[PDB]
């Protein structure tokens, strides 16, 4: 606990400077997300207050691209729900409460201009998926279907590349890997059933062949997803 | 399980699609003569 | 205008009853008439419907919005088209066993 | 519209990760339950209304088909009543065509 408190104090001191905080945030985005998660994970009031202060310093307007950094954090690291939960939570430090309120306000401001298509794009860029509600609610997959085929079907090409990478990495058959593969297959099936003009693009890129080959996966969910994709291809 | 039935149905659907494609090719072949006549007639008018 | 604060319905019996429950109109103590001029499409007459619509859309009527069911407004479609004045506005409310069709909307036809 | 066979509802069941739209994270449990129930009930009511409107439109189409079928009770009034028997071009005369 003492070591964690000292590390948090050092991080806060380093982030006190705006240039130093801006440099650290870009080079340690994963570390920043881990610290944000640990802020809610940790139960110590002092550690939570230090983590909130460190997050606020990185998100402070004095840092370069402060709005962009805050938006990237709220998108990739799911900072907005964590800040909302922290606001609903209770802390023994008034400074910690004020920092939590400021972080919640910043997250709300960032998410005010956010969109479901933006969340899907961020998830695709992160090359990770866990059956997000945009991939489940038909509203997003219907409104953003036209945008998927934009830029020579750039989104469809990225999804096909992600599916091919998952197929290459599917030999591990990890639970997280299986979930990601299933989510990618569902997204591909949706983007094929809606606006079927991308079927030829997927066939040319080899996505159809990869989907057909994925039917050999031992996972029952993967098998069902492959069967659904095959039915959407030529089946009924 | 039921996956065997789905694979058989999927194979049948793919086989059925081949017959439909052949009909499309047959329909196009018939239209080729009509298109050739129109092209020849248009060229004949220009030549005349 | 200030006197325009009133809503008129000329729809079917069920729609008229529902809107009266909502409380659209009032019975004029002096004129002994109410804005809830309930009139079945099959009952009364086309001439009577046209006369009621003309009275509600003219003669310095206080109705702001004229509510006519699509079924009843279809029979008086000529008068509905003729009513090109900006106010009072007219709407084609759907009726039971008579859904509203975009082709039957006189005002939307101006697009 | 996406086909029902491709609906990811079981895939969502595999995760069940709550979204912000269906319920605010910081909202109260009672408030979140009320909001979700109200939204889902409104969606169900809209679906029921759309189904009723489609049924009414189908009934109207069936009535039109019956009218076009030639049954004189619903067929064109031109063939139902003879032009000679029906009173025409007379201001003091009219036809019944029952």
UniProtKB/Swiss-Prot annotation, chain A:
Molecular function via GO: proton-transporting ATPase activity, rotational mechanism
UniProt function note: Subunit of the V1 complex of vacuolar(H+)-ATPase (V-ATPase), a multisubunit enzyme composed of a peripheral complex (V1) that hydrolyzes ATP and a membrane integral complex (V0) that translocates protons. V-ATPase is responsible for acidifying and maintaining the pH of intracellular compartments. This subunit is essential for activity, but not assembly, of the enzyme complex. This subunit is also required for silencing the ATPase activity of V-ATPase when V1 is detached from V0.
Extra remark beyond the main annotation: Present with 22500 molecules/cell in log phase SD medium.
The protein's assembly and partners: V-ATPase is a heteromultimeric enzyme composed of a peripheral catalytic V1 complex (components A to H) attached to an integral membrane V0 proton pore complex (components: a, c, c', c'', d, e, f and VOA1). Interacts with YND1.
Residues of the full protein shown: 240 to 475 of 478
Family from the record: Belongs to the V-ATPase H subunit family.
Effect noted on mutating residue 171 to A: Appears to have no effect on the ATPase activity of membrane-detached V-ATPase V1 or on cell population growth
Domain of life: Eukaryota
Disruption phenotype: Increases the ATPase activity of membrane-detached V-ATPase V1. Abolishes growth at pH 7.5 and in the presence of calcium chloride, abrogates growth at pH 5.0.
Protein name as it appears in the record: V-type proton ATPase subunit H
The keyword Membrane is assigned to this record: yes
GO cellular component labels: fungal-type vacuole membrane; Golgi membrane; proton-transporting V-type ATPase complex; vacuolar proton-transporting V-type ATPase complex; vacuolar proton-transporting V-type ATPase, V1 domain
Keywords in alphabetical order: Hydrogen ion transport, Ion transport, Membrane, Transport, Vacuole
Main localization category: membrane
Subcellular location: Vacuole membrane
Gene of this entry: VMA13
Record-level GO BP terms: endosomal lumen acidification; Golgi lumen acidification; proton transmembrane transport; vacuolar acidification
């Amino acid at each position: 606990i003492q070591l964690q408190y000292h590390s948090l104090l050092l991080i806060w001191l380093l982030t006190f400077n705006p240039v130093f905080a801006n440099e650290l945030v870009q080079k340690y985005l994963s570390d920043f997300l881990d610290l944000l998660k640990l802020v809610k994970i940790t139960i110590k009031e002092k550690v939570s207050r230090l983590c909130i202060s460190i997050i606020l310093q990185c998100c402070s307007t004095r840092v370069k691209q402060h709005k962009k950094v805050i938006k990237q954090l709220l998108l990739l690291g799911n900072a907005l729900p964590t800040v909302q939960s922290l606001s609903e939570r209770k802390y023994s430090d008034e400074e910690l409460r004020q920092d939590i309120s400021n972080l919640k306000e910043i997250l709300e401001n960032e998410y005010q201009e956010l969109t479901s298509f933006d969340e899907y794009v961020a998830e695709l860029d992160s090359k990770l998926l866990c059956w997000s509600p945009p991939h489940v609610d038909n509203g997003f997959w219907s409104d953003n279907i036209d945008e998927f085929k934009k830029d020579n079907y750039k989104i469809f090409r990225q999804l096909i590349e992600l599916l091919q990478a998952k197929v290459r990495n599917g030999d591990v058959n990890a639970k997280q890997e299986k979930i990601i593969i299933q989510v990618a297959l569902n997204d591909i099936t949706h983007v094929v059933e809606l606006l079927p003009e991308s079927i030829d693009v997927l066939d040319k890129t080899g996505g159809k062949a990869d989907i057909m080959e994925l039917l050999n996966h031992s996972d029952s969910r993967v098998k069902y997803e492959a069967l659904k994709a095959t039915q959407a291809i030529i089946g009924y | 399980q039921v996956n065997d039935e789905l694979n058989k149905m999927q194979a049948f659907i793919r086989k059925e699609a081949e017959e439909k494609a052949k009909e499309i090719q047959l329909k196009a072949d018939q239209e080729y003569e009509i298109e050739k006549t129109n092209i020849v007639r248009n060229e004949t008018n220009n030549i005349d | 205008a200030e006197k325009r604060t009133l809503i008129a319905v000329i729809a079917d019996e069920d729609t008229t009853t529902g809107l009266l429950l909502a409380g659209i109109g009032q019975i004029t103590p002096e004129t002994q008439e109410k804005n809830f001029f309930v009139y079945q499409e099959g009952k009364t007459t086309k001439e009577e419907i046209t006369d009621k619509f003309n009275h509600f859309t003219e003669e310095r009527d206080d109705i702001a919005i004229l509510l006519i069911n699509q079924h009843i407004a279809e029979n008086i479609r000529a008068r509905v088209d003729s009513f090109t004045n900006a106010f009072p506005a007219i709407l084609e409310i759907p009726s039971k066993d008579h859904p509203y069709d975009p082709e039957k909307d006189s005002v939307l036809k101006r697009v | 519209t996406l086909p029902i066979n491709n609906m990811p509802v079981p895939e969502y069941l595999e995760n069940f990760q709550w979204q912000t739209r269906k319920f605010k994270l910081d909202k109260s449990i009672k408030d979140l339950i009320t909001l979700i129930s109200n939204e889902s009930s409104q969606l169900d009511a809209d679906v029921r209304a759309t189904y009723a409107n489609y049924n009414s439109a189908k009934t109207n189409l069936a009535a039109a088909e019956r009218k076009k079928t030639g049954d004189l009770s619903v067929r064109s009034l031109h063939d139902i009543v003879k032009p000679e028997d029906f009173v025409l071009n007379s201001e003091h005369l009219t036809t019944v065509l029952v």
